[PDB]
Amino acid sequence: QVQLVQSGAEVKKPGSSVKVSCKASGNSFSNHDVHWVRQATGQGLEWMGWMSHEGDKTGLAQKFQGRVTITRDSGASTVYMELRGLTADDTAIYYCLTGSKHRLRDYFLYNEYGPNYEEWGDYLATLDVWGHGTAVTVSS
Amino acid sequence: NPQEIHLENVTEEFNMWKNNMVEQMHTDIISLWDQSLKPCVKLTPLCV
Ligand SMILES: *[C@@H]1O[C@H](CO)[C@@H](O[C@@H]2O[C@H](CO)[C@@H](O[C@@H]3O[C@H](CO[C@H]4O[C@H](CO[C@H]5O[C@H](CO)[C@@H](O)[C@H](O)[C@@H]5O)[C@@H](O)[C@H](O[C@H]5O[C@H](CO)[C@@H](O)[C@H](O)[C@@H]5O)[C@@H]4O)[C@@H](O)[C@H](O[C@H]4O[C@H](CO)[C@@H](O)[C@H](O)[C@@H]4O[C@H]4O[C@H](CO)[C@@H](O)[C@H](O)[C@@H]4O)[C@@H]3O)[C@H](O)[C@H]2NC(C)=O)[C@H](O)[C@H]1NC(C)=O
Ligand SMILES: *[C@@H]1O[C@H](CO)[C@@H](O[C@@H]2O[C@H](CO)[C@@H](O[C@@H]3O[C@H](CO)[C@@H](O)[C@H](O)[C@@H]3O)[C@H](O)[C@H]2NC(C)=O)[C@H](O)[C@H]1NC(C)=O
């Protein structure tokens, strides 16, 4: 079991950004997908975003576009996320979890005289074990 | 011995820009260039 670490809970003023961090022991982020999740008590899980274990892809649930970024420490021992514009209805439990994916060629053309034309994509397979999480709330 | 002789008592017409020896050189040289070009590797992988 890889140890996971996440930033302490924080209260923030409305209309403004917050930032969080996470870590994986053994620098195992190189072998797992970075993910962020959000939840409110009495409510279902919401995916927030991810980074590939290769680190060559990132993304967000569309609700977060233009409000969220993901960065990492060199050698990927830790990861970070920044959230922007938060308001009192953004109070939620935030999570950092490791993950797995399947990478399969989605299209190809063989080339006799060159690299094959190829298209590829990622399909999430499973969530790996969850981080302890962070709580973030917003108030005056 | 690429001998030449001056001809006694002779003159002759010449026409630069009309002689086709030059034209032969134009296509002979090109053909030679291609002759050595043909047995070689294509670089079309590099259009990536
Ligand atoms: C010729 O081309 C084909 C493609 O056309 C090649 O196959 C493709 O190979 C790549 C790997 O090179 C695969 O990507 C990897 O997929 C696995 C998941 O796939 C496994 O599970 C399948 C599902 O099994 C269940 O369900 C079926 C019914 O559907 C049941 O029969 C089973 O019993 C199970 O219940 C299983 O079907 C798969 O087998 C297929 O593929 C193999 C070749 O891999 C063939 O021999 C088989 O005949 C069959 O077609 C397969 O067993 C993911 O787990 C992988 O994710 C890892 O890698 C990512 C980076 O690429 C990384 O981002 C992820 O985090 C993850 O990393 C983990 O694994 C690494 C080792 O792989 C570790 O280093 C790392 O630490 C970490 O642990 C990955 O996505 C393609 O899926 C596969 N194509 C298809 C459509 O399946 C074929 O290999 C080529 N031949 C040759 C000789 O090269
Ligand atoms: C040209 O090749 C591309 C792949 O390189 C083909 O893309 C495929 O296009 C279809 C249509 O957009 C995608 O199908 C999707 O399937 C789901 C479920 O059936 C449906 O919900 C969507 O509406 C859609 O039809 C398909 O996923 C996509 N493939 C990939 C790799 O993205 C396209 O079909 C090719 N054209 C020719 C003429 O073959």
UniProtKB/TrEMBL annotation, chain B:
Record PTM: Highly glycosylated by host. The high number of glycan on the protein is reffered to as 'glycan shield' because it contributes to hide protein sequence from adaptive immune system.
Compartment list: Host cell membrane; Host endosome membrane; Virion membrane
Glycosylation sites: N9
Similarity annotation: Belongs to the HIV-1 env protein family.
Domain notes: The CD4-binding region is targeted by the antibody b12. The 17 amino acids long immunosuppressive region is present in many retroviral envelope proteins. Synthetic peptides derived from this relatively conserved sequence inhibit immune function in vitro and in vivo.
Other facts noted in the record for this chain: HIV-1 lineages are divided in three main groups, M (for Major), O (for Outlier), and N (for New, or Non-M, Non-O). The vast majority of strains found worldwide belong to the group M. Group O seems to be endemic to and largely confined to Cameroon and neighboring countries in West Central Africa, where these viruses represent a small minority of HIV-1 strains. The group N is represented by a limited number of isolates from Cameroonian persons. The group M is further subdivided in 9 clades or subtypes (A to D, F to H, J and K). Inhibitors targeting HIV-1 viral envelope proteins are used as antiretroviral drugs. Attachment of virions to the cell surface via non-specific interactions and CD4 binding can be blocked by inhibitors that include cyanovirin-N, cyclotriazadisulfonamide analogs, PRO 2000, TNX 355 and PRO 542. In addition, BMS 806 can block CD4-induced conformational changes. Env interactions with the coreceptor molecules can be targeted by CCR5 antagonists including SCH-D, maraviroc (UK 427857) and aplaviroc (GW 873140), and the CXCR4 antagonist AMD 070.
Complex formation: The mature envelope protein (Env) consists of a homotrimer of non-covalently associated gp120-gp41 heterodimers. The resulting complex protrudes from the virus surface as a spike. There seems to be as few as 10 spikes on the average virion. Surface protein gp120 interacts with host CD4, CCR5 and CXCR4. Gp120 also interacts with the C-type lectins CD209/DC-SIGN and CLEC4M/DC-SIGNR (collectively referred to as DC-SIGN(R)). Gp120 and gp41 interact with GalCer.
Function field: Envelope glycoprotein gp160: Oligomerizes in the host endoplasmic reticulum into predominantly trimers. In a second time, gp160 transits in the host Golgi, where glycosylation is completed. The precursor is then proteolytically cleaved in the trans-Golgi and thereby activated by cellular furin or furin-like proteases to produce gp120 and gp41. Transmembrane protein gp41: Acts as a class I viral fusion protein. Under the current model, the protein has at least 3 conformational states: pre-fusion native state, pre-hairpin intermediate state, and post-fusion hairpin state. During fusion of viral and target intracellular membranes, the coiled coil regions (heptad repeats) assume a trimer-of-hairpins structure, positioning the fusion peptide in close proximity to the C-terminal region of the ectodomain. The formation of this structure appears to drive apposition and subsequent fusion of viral and target cell membranes.
Protein name per Swiss-Prot or TrEMBL: Envelope glycoprotein gp160
Full protein: residues contained: 79 to 126 of 860
